[PDB]
Each structure stands twice: as structure tokens, then as C-alpha cells.
């Protein structure tokens, strides 16, 4: 099965006594070691349900958004996922007012497309100073819109790396009617996320496993070969 319990060799663990007791229901009895390990059957069930939901939304020709903005690592994970398998992504900080309003971003993305097309058509027919200024403007527009330039409507579903760090983003998502999914840390509300996935968010390796599994969930629905497709073996990749 997907994410076999044997693969969960290092997946559980949380910060020492910083938790909402509403995750007491979705966790093991409180461990003395202050690192409350997790229940594997419920996380397996939730990951499978997320797998099916992503399958369905991809079948109905939908688009999903990826957000990852921790210190150095998760942004790199999302970047590697983006360039590896096609998916809508945001690598830099989610801006206040990025989902509840689209016109203010539709103008920006359309201007980005128009000026990048012009730059492709601009073959030094303008002055070098103005060309460099335009290139800097394109970099400015792309460094906040790293992946949102190919979708022209609202996303049907999206994942969140940390619900306590996309607080504005998740609040805006709950304002609208679209469902959301995230690696729900044990410091949230069991209402801000429609599909609860309890896991670690400060340990890089578990985040790696789950981001890769969800990327595969959206990929295998694209008629694209994947590696975690009911494969009992696993892989070794560590932070540095």
C-alpha cells in the first residue's frame, strides 16, 4: 500500500508541549518524552483519501496549487517538484489577497505574459539600459509569480506545507468554498483544513516523503510514470 507502515521509520515526532488538545483525538496517548508519536492507520487512511481526491480533481481537468516557504528546504522541495512534474506552484511568500481576489492578480499575470512575449520579440531593438530595466521588471514580476502564469482561473484544490505559516492563505481559502489539504501540524484547528494530514513540519525527511507522495498523486493521473505507486521499497534522502 501507499506509504507502508514500514516506510514510517522516521515520521513521528513533534515539538515539546505546544499543541491544541483538539489533536488529542488524532494522536496517540500523550507521551512523556514531549514528542507525541502519531497513529499510522489514520495517517494512512487520510493519505489514501487525499490520493483519491487528487485523482478525481485531476480527472475532472482541474488545477492544484503548491505552496512552500520555509527557511531553505521546503521552497527547494516545491521548486524540484515543479520542474520535475508540471504543477502550479508558489515558491516565494503568499501575498495577502492572493485567492479571495483575482482581478488584481489577473492584471499582473497578463502583464507578465505580455511583457515576456515582448522580451522574446525584443531582440535588442531597444536600448541596452531600457532592456536591462525591462529584464529587471520581468525578474520582479517572476520572483513573486514563479508558477502562476499558465492558469487563468481559480484553483479547485491546493496543498499547504504548514497551516500555521500560511495562516492568511488558509483563512482566505476557508473564506471561499474550495476545499484545501495540508500537512496539519498538531497546533491547528480541526476545521481550517478539510482533509487532516497529521505529520511533522520541522523534520525535513517526513515533509520530503509527503510532498513527494502528493506530487506522485497528481502525477500518476497525468498518464506519467511515478515511483511511489504501491511500491513496497523506499528511498534514502537526507537534509544537509
Amino acid at each position: 500500500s501507499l506509504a507502508k507502515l514500514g516506510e514510517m521509520r522516521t515520521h513521528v515526532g513533534m515539538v515539546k508541549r505546544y499543541w491544541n488538545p483538539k489533536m488529542g483525538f488524532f494522536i496517540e496517548p500523550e507521551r512523556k518524552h514531549n514528542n507525541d508519536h502519531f497513529v499510522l492507520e489514520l495517517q494512512r487512511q487520510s493519505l489514501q483519501t487525499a490520493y483519491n481526491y487528487v485523482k478525481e480533481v485531476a480527472q475532472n481537468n482541474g488545477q492544484i496549487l503548491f505552496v512552500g516557504t520555509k527557511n531553505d528546504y521546503v521552497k527547494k522541495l516545491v521548486n524540484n517538484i515543479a520542474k520535475r512534474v508540471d504543477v502550479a506552484f508558489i515558491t516565494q511568500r503568499w501575498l495577502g489577497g492572493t485567492l479571495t481576489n483575482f482581478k488584481t492578480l489577473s492584471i499582473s499575470i497578463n502583464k507578465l505574459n505580455k511583457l515576456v512575449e515582448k522580451q522574446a520579440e525584443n531582440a535588442a531593438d531597444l536600448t541596452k539600459k531600457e532592456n536591462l530595466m525591462l529584464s529587471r521588471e520581468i525578474e520582479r514580476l517572476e520572483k513573486f509569480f514563479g508558477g502562476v502564469k499558465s492558469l487563468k482561473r481559480l484553483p479547485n484544490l491546493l496543498i499547504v506545507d504548514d497551516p500555521v505559516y500560511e495562516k492568511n492563505a488558509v483563512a482566505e481559502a476557508n473564506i471561499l468554498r474550495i476545499p484545501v489539504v495540508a500537512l496539519c501540524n498538531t497546533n491547528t484547528n480541526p476545521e481550517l483544513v478539510d482533509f487532516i494530514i497529521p505529520a511533522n513540519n520541522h523534520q525535513p525527511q517526513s515533509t520530503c516523503l509527503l510532498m513527494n507522495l502528493l506530487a506522485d498523486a497528481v502525477a500518476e493521473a497525468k498518464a506519467m510514470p511515478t515511483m511511489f505507486a504501491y511500491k513496497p521499497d523506499e528511498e534514502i534522502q537526507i537534509e544537509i
Binding site: 481526491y53 478525481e56 480533481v57 475532472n60 476545499p179 478539510d194
Partner: peptide, 5 residues
């Protein structure tokens, strides 16, 4: 929202 069709 189990179903999506």
C-alpha cells in the same frame, strides 16, 4: 465533500 462529479 466526498464526491466531486
Amino acid at each position: 465533500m466526498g464526491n466531486f462529479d
